Design a protein around this ligand. Structure first.
Ligand SMILES: *[C@@H]1O[C@H](CO)[C@@H](O[C@@H]2O[C@H](CO)[C@@H](O)[C@H](O)[C@H]2NC(C)=O)[C@H](O)[C@H]1NC(C)=O
Lengths: 50, 50
């Protein structure tokens, strides 16, 4: 199970760290401290008939 | 008086089909400048903390 909030993910640190999500086609503000956050997609399909 | 007739018919049919595709598209390419690269503030922080 995922559990409760432990890290503050939205301390911007006085930075204006815009990222443009090419997926959502929108700008988001990253925190000042997160190392990376990126929006490239993978899709995996497994399909079985018996 | 003895009379006997027999007829037997059997058919067996088997089909196997397979397909694989691997298709790869390039739409953007780039080259970085050699010098004066503006490092991320997170990276600068990491380095200065060293
Ligand atoms: C990006 O890919 C292109 C395509 O191969 C690389 O070189 C180009 O090749 C075409 C086809 O011969 C030429 O018309 C262009 O003049 C070439 N140069 C460019 C800049 O398009 C290119 O070297 C690759 N890298 C970069 C940074 O563009």
């Amino acid at each position: 199970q995922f559990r409760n909030r432990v890290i503050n993910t939205k301390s911007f640190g006085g930075q204006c760290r815009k990222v443009f999500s090419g997926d959502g086609k929108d700008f988001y503000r990253l925190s000042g401290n997160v190392l990376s956050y990126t929006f490239q997609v993978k899709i995996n399909n497994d399909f079985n008939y018996e | 008086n003895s009379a006997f007739k027999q007829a037997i018919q059997a058919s067996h049919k088997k089909d196997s089909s397979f397909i694989r595709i691997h298709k790869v598209m390039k739409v953007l390419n780039f080259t970085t400048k050699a010098k004066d690269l503006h490092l991320s503030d997170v990276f600068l922080k990491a380095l200065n903390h060293l």
